[PDB]
Paper text:
In mammalian heart mitochondria, the majority of CI is found in association with CIII2 and CIV (SC I+III2+IV; respirasome) or in association with CIII2 alone (SC I+III2).
These focused refinements were performed on the peripheral arm of CI, on the membrane arm of CI and on CIII2, resulting in reconstructions at 3.8–3.9 Å resolution and improved atomic models for each region of the SC.
Numbering used by the authors:
A (entry chain S8): 60 to 118
B (entry chain V3): 35 to 75
C (entry chain S1): 6 to 235
D (entry chain V2): 5 to 216
E (entry chain V1): 9 to 438
F (entry chain S4): 68 to 133
Write the structure that this text describes.
């Protein structure tokens, strides 16, 4: 359960796993997460920008 | 008695209710109006 | 001088005749939780969340549409008031899908706030959860009718203010769709106001749809243009 | 069960639908039953008249009822989708409804269902590969003192058994509609044995009247 | 005090229940209808209200409010709006068969009762809401109303009085809650059939807004004989509070199932055996007996060895007596399957205003399906008890309470059979 | 210009001072020095709604859909 170098997962044989639901931006105690969301042409809600500062991140 | 006194309703067709409703048109109270002819006048 | 005494939680207050129980509880400052009462529309008794106990009475009455008799004494924090609220809340979250991440009213829902501050903690209802095919009300209003709680507040709003008469309940039992039967684009004035009326994330905004989240955007007072009313 | 219209070009207005002027005279009488100023209350009998003038009702019929009774159409769509007479999908000439809830089921209803099923072939909900035998099961029709019961169009059948099912279906195939009374004795709701209820003739006028 | 008795003929309220006698206005006049009715119309509504409150006519239809107090609620001082009488002739509550028989065989007694009820409160018109599934009997009622108007009997100068009065027949469209007290009133108005809230009672806001009242066909049909026969003679049948004659409809697993008229107070074993054959396989073969119909919890055998058929006695047995549907179920029948099909009935016929009955009937139907298959553990049957507590008493109408009662009666009385079913499925699946 | 954030030259912008009356608000704003615009508190109007008038006879408050 070691914590460090976080990265985004994706579905088994599929697309990105994130939703841009902004739960992680709401809970981030350093306020390091920056999310900007747009839906693509398919209609599923997605992102544009998901930026993390590793400098601010207390892990 | 042992003889069933219906079978008056044996030969009721489809439109008999509305035909009797048409036959009972006259001798009826004059349906009191209330301001407008409809809730949207 | 047209005064009636109501003891809200024991505390006395004078109230004009004809008003509801909920207006008296808001006259003392209480909020009885509610889903289908709205202070600009006609009162219907559909949602049943608004229940409150009157002392020396067997039944639990609906505070949205109850007039005031002489000398009440109203318990807003009694036993069966809380039991009725937790019960109605446990019914409402059954046929309501798991969409709180992808939903658009995720910060500003009412099921979430009232299921925090009034409802139960553990759930039940192992099997079930109906799903309803969504409609297309308009190209300005995104419509996911799976999240609908059938509170019938879009219909009362359309019929009594927009004057259009296009939205209708259809069906019985669990199968009560709320929408247009004839695939017709509900296109009229004040069609945008229906997204603030619908308290759950069913009738949501189309251009706003998946672009924000309401705990981040800060609020600012401002005045309209392009209309003489402002 | 398809509570969205989904144009389906046998529907999809305008489908040609019109009333006989004798039916206009009917609708005049039905609207004159109700008090003036509340003309919107005749939607249910006028829409029933449309159902019996055209065996299943299209969307042009609902629009025409809304035009005659000057109501918005959406209220007519609510009333047509709410009730159970107004079969919006097209049905056949005859329309079998097997009524089963508790006492119908508690007196061996499933044998009647399988007898209909193997005399006709097609299952519930759908229809035969022609018209006139749309089969559905239904909830209580109100004759619970008899068998699981058979409703054909505006006609009951009570106190049945699968051989009488075969008789009724073959005579409907012949076209000669049978008598709508119950079968196998007790022509109405009677104790079928000795008839231990009232036997003496009634007393007529003035039997113990007081301050009339 | 006659010790709870049994009925004897010449005191039945209405004969010709089987169609054996001539049905016409001539036949009704031979049987004894429309006799001295002008002196009933010309005596005053104080007399009719005093007679009905004196006789103690307990109201029928499943509610059980006393009829005299309701008709006295209809004595508002007269405003510029008229008053209506709505005769409710629906049969839901599967087991009923109650006033289908009256409305087919003797409609002239219904016209008796509606004229006396219209005079009783200054009413102006009587809307008779018949079930949509009763088309032949609706045509028979139209023939009766036609002959009533054609003999100059009612209409303008009703029975020679100076009191106009008319009767209209509204066919329904097929529902069960249109049989209620107020969704009936919205079904007349041309809306969809859904109930209203209670703080406007029908004595203040009713059919389009006029103060109306709703009455069952048994109460209406007994209402002329209360006036034309003796004062409080109707309360010489049974106990004192709940008194008179009632139809009893014995369907199900009895030999020759039928309908009878009897006293209100009557023992259940004598009711079942001595008028409708016997229980198939002797008296010991029966498993349970539900009185009332679908809005009443069940009665096991050891309770129904003694308990008579009265409102207060069945409330002391913790079962609210509905209307006359005294049906049985056999030892060799899955009572769980029968009650689960009854819950499927409530799912098919219920509107969806209230979130409690809608969501609760959803859960109770899925849970009763799983208990027919036996696919749970006893914490689920306790949770079924919890939801059947939470539905009852939080709705508009009494269909939610009626969906909560038989589930409660099943959990009260047939607990170990559910335990055995779930044990069988566990031993087979494991 | 490296990530697309919202940089600002504003220390005082992220403040909020929740008070309980207008008088103490004006007193604090005049005490601590800066300018102030005091807006108005606009209560909801006490209406009178009635289900019985939602089901009236001759009036135009006939909902026709419930
Ligand atoms: C679910 C339900 C079913 C009802 N079924 C009937 C019915 O079959 N017949 C009837 O006249 N009233 C029926 N009612 C209405 C009430 O019984 C109503 O009180 C009755 O018409 C008059 O009551 P009373 O005889 O006590 O005056 C029903 C009510 C509900 C809630
Ligand atoms: S926004 Fe954050 S919390 Fe939400 S799905 Fe994406 S990574 Fe997970
Ligand atoms: S409407 Fe409310 S409860 Fe439903 S998914 Fe959206 S946030 Fe969740
Ligand atoms: S769409 Fe929204 S406003 Fe309309 S009934 Fe459903 S939850 Fe209520
Ligand atoms: S309890 Fe159910 S059937 Fe009764 S009014 Fe409410 S939604 Fe309709
Ligand atoms: S607010 Fe009273 S029922 Fe919804
Ligand atoms: S259940 Fe079949 S007739 Fe009542």
């Amino acid at each position: 359960r070691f914590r460090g170098e976080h990265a985004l997962r994706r579905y088994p044989s599929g697309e990105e796993r994130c939703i841009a639901c902004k739960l992680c931006e709401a809970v981030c105690p350093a306020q390091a997460i920056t999310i900007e969301a747009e839906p693509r042409a398919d209609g599923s809600r997605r992102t544009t920008r998901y930026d993390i500062d590793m400098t601010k991140c207390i892990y | 008695n042992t003889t069933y006194k219906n079978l008056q309703h044996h030969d009721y067709s489809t439109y008999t209710f509305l035909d009797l409703n048409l036959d009972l048109s006259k001798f009826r109270m004059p349906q009191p109006s209330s301001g407008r002819e409809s809730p949207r006048h | 001088s047209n005064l009636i005494e109501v003891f809200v939680d024991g505390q006395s207050v004078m109230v004009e005749p004809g008003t509801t129980v909920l207006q008296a509880c808001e006259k003392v400052g209480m909020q009885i939780p509610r889903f289908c009462y709205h202070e600009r529309l006609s009162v219907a008794g559909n949602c049943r969340m608004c229940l409150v106990e009157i002392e020396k009475a067997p039944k639990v009455v609906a505070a949205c549409a109850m007039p005031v008799m002489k000398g009440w004494n109203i318990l807003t924090n009694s036993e069966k008031t809380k039991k009725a609220r937790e019960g109605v809340m446990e019914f409402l979250l059954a046929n309501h899908p798991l969409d709180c991440p992808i939903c658009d009213q995720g910060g500003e829902c009412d099921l979430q706030d009232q299921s925090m501050m009034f409802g139960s903690d553990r759930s039940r209802f192992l099997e079930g959860k109906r799903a309803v095919e969504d409609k297309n009300i308009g190209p300005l209003v995104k419509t996911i009718m799976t999240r609908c709680i059938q509170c019938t507040r879009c219909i009362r709003f359309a019929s009594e203010i927009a004057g259009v008469d296009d939205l209708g309940t259809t069906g019985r039992g669990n199968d009560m769709q709320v929408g247009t039967y004839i695939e017709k684009m509900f296109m009229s004035e004040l069609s945008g106001n229906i997204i603030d009326i619908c308290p759950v994330g069913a009738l949501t905004s189309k251009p706003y749809a998946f672009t924000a989240r309401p705990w981040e955007t800060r609020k600012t007072e401002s005045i309209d243009v392009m209309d003489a009313v402002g | 069960a398809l509570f969205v219209h989904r144009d389906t070009p046998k529907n999809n207005p305008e489908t040609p639908f019109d009333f006989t002027p004798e039916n206009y005279k009917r609708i005049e009488a039905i609207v004159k039953n109700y008090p003036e100023g509340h003309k919107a209350a005749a939607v249910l009998p006028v829409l029933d008249l449309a159902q019996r003038q055209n065996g299943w009702l299209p969307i042009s019929a609902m629009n025409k009822v809304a035009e005659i009774l000057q109501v918005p159409p959406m209220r007519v769509y609510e009333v047509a989708t709410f009730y159970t007479m107004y079969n919006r999908k097209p049905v056949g000439k005859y329309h079998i409804q097997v009524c089963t809830t508790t006492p119908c089921m508690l007196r061996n209803s499933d044998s009647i269902l399988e007898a209909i099923q193997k005399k006709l072939g097609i299952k519930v909900g759908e229809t035969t590969p022609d018209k006139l035998f749309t089969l559905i099961e239904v909830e209580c029709l109100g004759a619970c003192v008899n068998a699981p019961m058979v409703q054909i169009n505006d006609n009951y059948y009570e106190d049945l058994t699968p051989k009488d099912i075969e008789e009724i279906i073959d005579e409907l195939k012949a076209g000669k509609i049978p008598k709508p009374g119950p079968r196998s004795g007790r022509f109405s709701c009677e104790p079928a044995g000795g008839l231990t209820s009232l036997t003496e003739p009634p007393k007529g006028p003035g039997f113990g009247v007081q301050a009339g | 005090k006659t010790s709870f008795g049994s009925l004897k003929d010449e005191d039945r309220i209405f004969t010709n229940l089987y169609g054996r006698h001539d049905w016409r206005l001539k036949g009704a006049q031979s049987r004894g209808d429309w006799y001295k009715t002008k002196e009933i119309l010309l005596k005053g509504p104080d007399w009719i209200l005093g007679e009905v409150k004196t006789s103690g006519l307990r109201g029928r239809g499943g509610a059980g409010f006393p009829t005299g107090l309701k008709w006295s609620f209809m004595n508002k001082p007269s405003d510029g709006r008229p008053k209506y009488l709505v005769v409710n002739a629906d049969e839901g509550e599967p087991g009923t068969c109650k006033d289908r028989e009256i409305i087919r065989h003797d409609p002239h007694k219904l016209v008796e009762g509606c004229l006396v009820g219209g005079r009783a409160m200054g009413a102006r018109a009587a809307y008779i809401y018949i079930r949509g599934e009763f088309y032949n009997e609706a045509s028979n009622l139209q023939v009766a109303i036609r002959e009533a108007y054609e003999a100059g009997l009612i209409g303008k100068n009703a029975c020679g009085s100076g009191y106009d009065f008319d009767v209209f027949v509204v066919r329904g469209a097929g529902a069960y809650i249109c049989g209620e007290e107020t969704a009936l009133i919205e079904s007349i108005e041309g809306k969809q059939g859904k109930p209203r809230l209670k703080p406007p009672f029908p004595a203040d806001v009713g059919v389009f807004g006029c103060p109306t009242t709703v009455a069952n066909v048994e109460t209406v049909a007994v209402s002329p004989t209360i006036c034309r026969r003796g004062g409080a003679w109707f309360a010489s049948f049974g106990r004192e509070r709940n008194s008179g004659t009632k139809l009893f409809n014995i369907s199900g697993h009895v030999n020759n199932p039928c309908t009878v008229e009897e006293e209100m107070s009557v023992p259940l074993k004598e009711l079942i055996e001595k008028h409708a054959g016997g229980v198939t396989g002797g008296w010991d073969n029966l498993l349970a007996v539900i009185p009332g119909g679908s809005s009443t919890p069940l009665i096991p055998k050891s309770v129904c060895e003694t308990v008579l058929m009265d409102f207060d006695a069945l409330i002391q047995a913790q079962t609210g007596l509905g209307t006359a549907a005294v049906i049985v179920m056999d030892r060799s029948t899955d009572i769980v399957k029968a009650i689960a099909r009854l819950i499927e009935f409530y799912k098919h016929e219920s509107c969806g205003q209230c979130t409690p009955c809608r969501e609760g009937v959803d859960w109770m139907n899925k849970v009763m399906a799983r208990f027919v298959r036996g696919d749970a553990r006893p914490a689920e049957i306790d949770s079924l008890w919890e939801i059947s507590k939470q539905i009852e008493g939080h709705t508009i109408c009494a269909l939610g309470d009626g969906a909560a009662w038989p589930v409660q009666g099943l959990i009260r009385h047939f607990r170990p059979e559910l335990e055995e079913r779930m044990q069988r499925f566990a031993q087979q699946h494991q | 210009p490296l990530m697309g954030w919202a940089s600002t030259a504003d220390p005082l912008s992220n403040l909020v001072l929740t008070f309980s009356t207008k008088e103490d608000a004006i007193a604090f704003a005049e005490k601590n020095g800066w300018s102030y615009d005091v807006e108005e508190r606009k209560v909801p109007k006490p209406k009178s709604k009635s289900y019985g008038a939602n089901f009236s006879w001759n009036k135009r408050t006939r909902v026709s859909t419930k």
